[PDB]
Amino acid sequence: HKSEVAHRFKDLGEENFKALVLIAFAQYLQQCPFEDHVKLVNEVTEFAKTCVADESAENCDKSLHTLFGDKLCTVATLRETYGEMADCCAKQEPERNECFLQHKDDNPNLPRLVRPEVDVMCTAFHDNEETFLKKYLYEIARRHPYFYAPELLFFAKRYKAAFTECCQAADKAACLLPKLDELRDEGKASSAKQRLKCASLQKFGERAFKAWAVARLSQRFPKAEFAEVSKLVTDLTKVHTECCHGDLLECADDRADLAKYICENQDSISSKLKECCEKPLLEKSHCIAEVENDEMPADLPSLAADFVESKDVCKNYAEAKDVFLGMFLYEYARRHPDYSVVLLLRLAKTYETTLEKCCAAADPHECYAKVFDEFKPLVEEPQNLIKQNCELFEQLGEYKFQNALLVRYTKKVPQVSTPTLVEVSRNLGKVGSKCCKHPEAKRMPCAEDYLSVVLNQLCVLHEKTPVSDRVTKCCTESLVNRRPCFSALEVDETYVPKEFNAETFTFHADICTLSEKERQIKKQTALVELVKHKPKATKEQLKAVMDDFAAFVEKCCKADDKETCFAEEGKKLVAASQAALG
Ligand SMILES: CCCCCCCCCCCCCC(=O)O
Ligand SMILES: CCCCCCCCCCCCCC(=O)O
Ligand SMILES: CCCCCCCCCCCCCC(=O)O
Ligand SMILES: CCCCCCCCCCCCCC(=O)O
Ligand SMILES: CCCCCCCCCCCCCC(=O)O
Numbered sequence: 337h338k339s340e341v342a343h344r345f346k347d348l349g350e351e352n353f354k355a356l357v358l359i360a361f362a363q364y365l366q367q368c369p370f371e372d373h374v375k376l377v378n379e380v381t382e383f384a385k386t387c388v389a390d391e392s393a394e395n396c397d398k399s400l401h402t403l404f405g406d407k408l409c410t411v412a413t414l415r416e417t418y419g420e421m422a423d424c425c426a427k428q429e430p431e432r433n434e435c436f437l438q439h440k441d442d443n444p445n446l447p448r449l450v451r452p453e454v455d456v457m458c459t460a461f462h463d464n465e466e467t468f469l470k471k472y473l474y475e476i477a478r479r480h481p482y483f484y485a486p487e488l489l490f491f492a493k494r495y496k497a498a499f500t501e502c503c504q505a506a507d508k509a510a511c512l513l514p515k516l517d518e519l520r521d522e523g524k525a526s527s528a529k530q531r532l533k534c535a536s537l538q539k540f541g542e543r544a545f546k547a548w549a550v551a552r553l554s555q556r557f558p559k560a561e562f563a564e565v566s567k568l569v570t571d572l573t574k575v576h577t578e579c580c581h582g583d584l585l586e587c588a589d590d591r592a593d594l595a596k597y598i599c600e601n602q603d604s605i606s607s608k609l610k611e612c613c614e615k616p617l618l619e620k621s622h623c624i625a626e627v628e629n630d631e632m633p634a635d636l637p638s639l640a641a642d643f644v645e646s647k648d649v650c651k652n653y654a655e656a657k658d659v660f661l662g663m664f665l666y667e668y669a670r671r672h673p674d675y676s677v678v679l680l681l682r683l684a685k686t687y688e689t690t691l692e693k694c695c696a697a698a699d700p701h702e703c704y705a706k707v708f709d710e711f712k713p714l715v716e717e718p719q720n721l722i723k724q725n726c727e728l729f730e731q732l733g734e735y736k737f738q739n740a741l742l743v744r745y746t747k748k749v750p751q752v753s754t755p756t757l758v759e760v761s762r763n764l765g766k767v768g769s770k771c772c773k774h775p776e777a778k779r780m781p782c783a784e785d786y787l788s789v790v791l792n793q794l795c796v797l798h799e800k801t802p803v804s805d806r807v808t809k810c811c812t813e814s815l816v817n818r819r820p821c822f823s824a825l826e827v828d829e830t831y832v833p834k835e836f837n838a839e840t841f842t843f844h845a846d847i848c849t850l851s852e853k854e855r856q857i858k859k860q861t862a863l864v865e866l867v868k869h870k871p872k873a874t875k876e877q878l879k880a881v882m883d884d885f886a887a888f889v890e891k892c893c894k895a896d897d898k899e900t901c902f903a904e905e906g907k908k909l910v911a912a913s914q915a916a917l918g
């Protein structure tokens with residue numbers, strides 16, 4: 337081009353450029369004040385415009401990595417603030433850039449960000465919308481140094497639309513708060529997946545990643561040819577590798593190439609790539625990334641023809657094992673947008689074991705003659721779990737359905753921490769209200785994506801402070817066997833009851849003045865604690881104690897002497913409840 341900055345600036349826009357540079361610097365210099373980044377931004381935008389004007393102006397020829405490294409190395413307190421990172425400045429590119437990557441702290445000290453009052457928030461927004469949004473863009477980016485910037489920028493825009501709209505509403509809090517919470521989760525969800533869709537690539541290798549990729553792509557581009565899906569799966573694997581390595585530029589560039597590629601051969605790949613492909617440079621891929629499944633051909637053959645009716649099956653499989661197996665996934669995946677990707681992998685794996693254990697036996701056609709029957713029970717397990725858990729979710733509500741999971745898992749692994757159980761059981765419940773509202777055709781996929789993060793979250797906590805070998809069994813198992821492993825946990829007969837504690841079961845009228853999502857957690861904490869005390873309690877006995885409590889809480893929060901009623905009836909409840917169990 338002659339000048340990268342000039343070109344990036346030109347096809348990015350001043351607004352987005354200023355935003356991305358800010359995020360970029362906040363991801364490395366996680367400890368410099370906000371006003372310090374604002375200075376650098378202006379400084380780099382000034383330079384950028386200098387190059388837009390004259391392509392041959394000072395340094396405009398330098399590459400973006402070099403320019404970026406110099407501005408980084410000009411920070412005076414670099415060595416005093418980051419120390420070892422300052423040594424990176426002594427080496428030259430590419431060694432210098434590789435050195436900054438290695439010193440990018442994944443999770444720093446930084447205090448938890450707190451949400452101020454809607455009023456001060458809206459007033460700050462109104463008074464000076466820009467430093468209000470940029471300041472927080474800064475707060476988020478320094479705490480999540482691996483979050484793809486363009487992505488973090490999409491969230492910024494959404495946060496903007498929530499303030500513009502709600503700070504102008506009658507009841508601001510009632511408008512903004514729900515939108516903010518919804519953004520937090522979606523944000524944390526997006527982050528978790530990115531960390532997950534790196535760790536996986538680290539542990540299980542390229543092969544397993546590609547497998548996951550073929551299934552996922554053919555499920556969405558069912559009309560594309562297998563050769564096209566292979567091409568995409570390849571480029572797609574290169575993208576994640578780089579993006580995971582942390583180099584933003586390389587990552588962003590590879591993602592752009594891919595998106596332009598898909599859009600040119602658009603006709604050859606999905607038909608639903610319409611709007612996405614006419615959108616600006618910055619959103620194209622993020623759009624392609626969420627595009628819905630194209631419709632499937634409907635004029636499609638049967639799999640058993642090419643994969644079971646032995647017309648030279650082993651002769652085709654030995655000729656190129658992975659390609660053939662890849663072809664299996666493609667065919668099976670695109671006929672089933674309703675299966676979770678892992679289920680597709682379990683089938684593909686099951687098929688693989690058969691071909692291996694069959695093709696080395698006299699007459700093959702009859703050894704693997706009935707594989708599709710091998711599949712049947714693999715497909716049903718997840719399906720039965722869905723509708724079974726979804727019907728329970730309708731009978732009870734999100735909350736009561738939450739208490740049910742609570743009793744179910746506290747019994748599975750009583751060893752686990754009470755606060756951890758409450759949180760995991762809550763997320764699980766949400767996945768229920770977030771997916772059970774879809775038609776059976778899109779439930780399994782939904783559950784899979786939500787369940788994959790909740791399960792990894794659960795697994796990471798257990799990493800730190802281990803508690804059960806069973807959880808560790810599942811957590812270190814194969815990604816394709818992780819959820820089935822958890823589903824296979826049974827009551828812990830071995831478990832020895834926690835000693836009764838008066839304290840843990842005492843309640844003051846303060847619960848009457850606590851928020852909805854606070855009363856619940858305090859009751860749900862008492863529930864876990866109750867089950868850990870009486871692990872042999874029946875669903876009947878437990879419901880009796882829970883009905884007595886539900887009433888007791890009102891009988892006292894609806895009375896004039898709150899805290900007498902809580903200490904008097906309280907002794908009774910505990911006394912009676914203790915006798916009803918044992
Ligand atoms: C990701 C870009 C954020 C840009 C600034 C928008 C304002 C964010 C809301 C401030 C509160 C954050 C904490 C929370 O929601 O719990
Ligand atoms: C001043 C240079 C900042 C460079 C890092 C930000 C990336 C700029 C290009 C944006 C391309 C995004 C491609 C995509 O996600 O589809
Ligand atoms: C609340 C913490 C529970 C920790 C251990 C149990 C994890 C079970 C979660 C995965 C649920 C899969 C669906 C099922 O119940 O079969
Ligand atoms: C996380 C709570 C989900 C609640 C709804 C029930 C879902 C049952 C599990 C289905 C698992 C699908 C993914 C897979 O094939 O392993
Ligand atoms: C050994 C006797 C312990 C007695 C204390 C009962 C514990 C109360 C937990 C029940 C929570 C029910 C939640 C609800 O109604 O929403």
Ligand SMILES: O=C(O)c1ccccc1O
Pocket residue numbers: 591594595621624625626
């Ligand atoms: O990031 C992409 O370029 C992409 C392309 C096709 C399908 C899913 C994706 O994430």
